[PDB]
Structures are given as structure tokens and as C-alpha cells.
Amino acid sequence: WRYGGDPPWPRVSPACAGRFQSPVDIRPQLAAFSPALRPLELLGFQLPPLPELRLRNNGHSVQLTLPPGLEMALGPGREYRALQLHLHWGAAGRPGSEHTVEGHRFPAEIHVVHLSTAFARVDEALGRPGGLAVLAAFLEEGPEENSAYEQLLSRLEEIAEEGSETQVPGLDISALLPSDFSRYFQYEGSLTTPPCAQGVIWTVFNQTVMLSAKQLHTLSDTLWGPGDSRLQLNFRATQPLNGRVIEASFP
Amino acid sequence: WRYGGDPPWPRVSPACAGRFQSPVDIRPQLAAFSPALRPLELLGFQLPPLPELRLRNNGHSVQLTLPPGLEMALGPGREYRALQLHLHWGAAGRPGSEHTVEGHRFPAEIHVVHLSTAFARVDEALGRPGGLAVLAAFLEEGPEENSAYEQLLSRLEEIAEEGSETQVPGLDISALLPSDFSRYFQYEGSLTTPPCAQGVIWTVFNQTVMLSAKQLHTLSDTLWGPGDSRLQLNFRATQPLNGRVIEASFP
Ligand SMILES: [Zn+2]
Ligand SMILES: [Zn+2]
């Protein structure tokens, strides 16, 4: 499968034709304030330099495989383990976030994908309610260089080739996300690539993360995808809410 | 195991000492109004007289086995199939609801237990978030004989001894539930008997159902449990919320 080209995604996986897909356009006017939504809690995200982590150009994104012991709770009793993180981006002067806010697309977006602690593997969790959870944050252009992101962005040149990988030092994974874990939107949707399984709990932070213009250019300009094409605009089209209500942890 | 005394339930199932158990004390002023909570949808609950349904004294309650085709939804795409319903009650002049409201225990309680349609079998769903969903309603004393409950209550004499069972005509299962499907409390907890599996979505109706004094007496004073012993006071004590916030579908 590819972005913006065949083969249709429903031909690859029937679930990609589900009613309750991601990403979505977040309309904060239509979000339901839900004071049951408490601040997110992360454990084990401050990684030491060793062991190193695998960073891969899989031809659709750059993906960092996370080690065991990264624990995340959406609440009491809603516990998850982090599996991997990856990024979605655009191209020179063209935004490439997956989620939009009132139709506005942001320059890029980070997804941290987690498995519910009730499941031992991803394939048992696919399509099950709350089986997977994703933490998502928008990346915007800021004045300063983000030093947490520089650790990964400085390594993209090694993995320019489609299907290539490299080992990188452990880093503070939580420093790739916003500092405010109390303000977020939450809704139930899907994986945004095949197999597009539903039951995924998406949490989208209100606060954004700032990268420099150079950093954003490095992200969009360095990697190559399938065919002789640049790996760019690697975001799925907006999917309708279809009656789902997005919750907000703040009024 | 048995209600009242030992064997401590943790000795039978260590799961019963989990952090997120049911039932709980509902305190409506501390419940969180969540406008995303939509009216419950129940289709296929209006059963014809045939085929007949199994009604069983199992020593811990009276349980009606439900046929296939009772579909329930808690939300968009969050669907369930009904498995069975059973009751909890007290004894002469003593209430035996499981859930309580601000300390108040009601005469009795009905539990309609469902399986998430993401799972083929109950055993796969046990311990998985949202795997099972229970619809719970309080039973109260009113001036009139409840016609719906009378179809079950008039058959208890036939199954008085522990482990006996009879066949009853199909009935409208939705007629056992309260008037307003838009007004409920919701939280995540557990089965209230061993094996005390967690991940159970409990939906407790704001409105009650009314049975006559004669009907409540009949429920509490007809069935026999484990030993020459009456089947009475078959409720678990309330359990600490341990940080869980009870949500409400209404302000
Ligand atoms: Zn993604
Ligand atoms: Zn019960």
C-alpha cells in the first residue's frame, strides 16, 4: 500500500472501510467537556543512552521502536505499554499533520502507539475496544531548535533509503511530547494505515511542540519512499466523525 | 464461595482483591457529567413466546439465559450482545441491592450481562477493557404489581431448590428496565462474584423499576441456596473507587 495511490486500502484491509476511522477534524466547539478525564501519567519514558533503539525508514514514515517498561495510563485502570513512535509531515511550505483543528493542518504530527496491558500482542488487540491507544501531538514552527527532536532528526540522513534502519541512543521520549498532560482531546477511532483497525483510543494534546524551520525541513526533505519518490505528505485524509463525540479534558 | 462469611473471596479468587472492583457507592454530586454519553440502544429485546428460555436457580441467584439477537450499544460502534440476566436481593424487611446511592441500599437489583461483539466468547472478554457490559437497575417497592417481573416471579416456586431449573415463555426483556434510557451512571469495574474479572463496563440507570411488596417478598423468600439455607442477601459489599470517577449522562 501507498499514500495517494493504489492499491484501494479496502482491498488491502476491509477495516479501512469502517465507519469510525481516524484521523479526524477536531472542532473544539463541538467537543464535550468531560471532567472525568484526568492528567495522563507516563512511567519509564526517560531512557538511558543504552540499549540503543531501532529507527527505521519503513517507506511510509520514520518509526522508532520503543523498549519494554514504558507505561502510560489514560486513567485509573486504563493502562498501556508503549510500542513505537512515528511522525507524519508535509513538504516545502505544505503542512502534513493527520489531525486537523477546524480545518487547519499543522506542519507535522507525532504518534506514540501503545498496547493495552490486557493484551500480549498487537494482533489480539486489533479491533478490540481500547486495545490500542495513541498519544498524538502537533509539531509547529518555532524560533528555537528542539534539542529532543534533534537527536532523531540528525540521524535521518543515515536512513534516507526506503526500508533502511539505524540504531540510536535512548533519549527522554516524554520530551518529544508537550509539557501539559492535563489538556487534551480524546476520541475512539482507528489505525491510520492498513489494517485500519477500530477501537483505538486517540488522545490529542492541546499544547503543541515547537521545532525550528530547519528541523521541519530536515524531516520533510531527507527521506525517500516507494519508486523514486520523496517521503512526504505521508498523512491520511480526514475521516468523518460519523456521530462520534470528541471529549475534552478542559472547559 | 458464598455470600456472608468465608471462603475470604481473595482465597477463592485473588482477582477479588483487585483495585477496580464492583459494586460501588454512587455519589451523584461527585459524578462527572459527560455529555458524550448518549442514550442506550437496545434492539431485539422484545422476544416472542417461543422458543422458551432457561430459568435457573444456581445457588447464588436466579438467572435467565437469553437467546441470540439481543443487540445493545453504549455508543457509536461500541456494541454488545445480551447473554443473561439475574437478580440480587435481601430478606424480610432488609434491602439487598449491590450498588448503593449515597449509602442507601435499595430492595433489589437487576443485572443484564452482555458480551462485546469484538469478542466471540465470554472467556476471551473476561479481563479485557469493555469486554463485558452490564446494565443495572434498582428495584423499589411501588403500589402496583409489575407485569414484566411477574412472568419470572411466578416461576420461582418451580425452581426453589439449589441447582433446579425450568423453561419460561419468551418475554419482553426491555420491559424489565426503567423508562428513560438517556439517564444513567457509568464506570469501569468488575464481576461481583468470583472470578471477579475487571474490565466490566457498568451502566446503572438513574431511574428505578417498581415491584409490589408481595413481589419483593416472593423474590426474597422463595429460593434455597447452598445446606438447608435460604437464597437471600445475595449481594457483595461495596468496594472502593480507588480513584475511579463515576460518569453521569445527565447534568
Ligand atoms: Zn501515525
Ligand atoms: Zn449480578
Beta bridge partners of B100: B25, B105
d(CA A191, CA B36): 22
Grid cell locating A188: 475512539
Segment 134-153 of chain A within 8 Å of chain B by CB: none
Beta bridge partners of B53: B168
- Output the CA torsion sign for B51, B203, A241, A245: positive
Which residue from B minimizes the CA distance to A132? B129
Angstrom distance (rounded) from CA B194 to CA B22: 11
Cell representation of residue A213: 524551520
CB B85 within 8 A of CB B110: yes
Q: Is A7 on the interface with B (CB under 8 A)?
A: no
Asked if the Cβ–Cβ distance from B245 to A38 is below 8 Å, we say: yes
* CB-CB neighbors (< 8 A) of A38 in chain B: 245
Distance CA B23, CA B238 (A): 5
C-alpha cell belonging to residue B53: 428460555
Angle at B246 (CA atoms; ends B241, B250), nearest 5 degrees = 165
E strand or H helix at B165: strand B165-168
Look at residue B89 and give its three-state secondary structure: strand
Q: DSSP states of A21-86 as a string?
A: -S--EE-GGGPEE-TT-PPPEEES-B--S-S-EEEEE-SS-EEEEPPTT-EEESSSS-EEEEEEEE
Q: Which residues, listed in sequence order, are joined to residue A57 by a DSSP beta bridge?
A: A62
Query: How many domains in chain A?
Result: 1
Question: Which CA distances in Å does B74 have to A87, A101, B42, B94?
Answer: 33, 27, 9, 33
Query: Cβ contacts of residue A226 below 8 Å, gap of 6+?
Result: A2, A59, A162
**Angle at CA of residue B53, ends B52 and B59, nearest 5°:** 145
SS3 content of chain A, % helix, strand, coil (to 5): 15, 35, 50
Nearest-angstrom CA–CA distance, B97 and B107: 6
Task: Report the C-alpha gap between A126 and A120 in whole angstroms.
Answer: 12
- Contact (CB<8Å) B242/A76: yes
Q: What single-letter DSSP state applies at residue B120? A: S
Q: Decide: A113 and A82 in contact? Cβ < 8 Å.
A: yes
Instruction: Please state, in angstroms and rounded to a whole number, the distance separating the CA atoms of residues A251 and A33.
Output: 5
C-alpha cell at A104: 487547519
Cβ B118–A130 below 8 Å, yes or no?
Answer: no
| Dist CA A189 CA B75 (whole Å) | 12
Helix, strand and coil in chain B, % to nearest 5: 15, 35, 50
Q: Tell me if the bond preceding A49 is cis, omega within 30° of 0.
A: no
Q: How far is CA B20 from the centre of its chain?
A: 17
At residue A181's C-alpha, the angle toward residues A180 and A183, to 5°, is 80
For residues B166 and B155, give the distance between their C-alpha atoms in angstroms, rounded to a whole number.
8
Query: The C-alpha cell of A123 is what?
Result: 494482533
Residues A82 and A143: beta-carbon distance below 8 Å: no
What are the residue ranges of helices labelled H in A126-176? 147-153
Whether B224 contacts B198, CB under 8 Å: no
Could you tell me the residue range of the domain that residue A132 belongs to?
1-251
State the CATH number of the domain containing residue A71.
3.10.200.10
Place of cell 441470540: B68
Resolution in A: 1.9
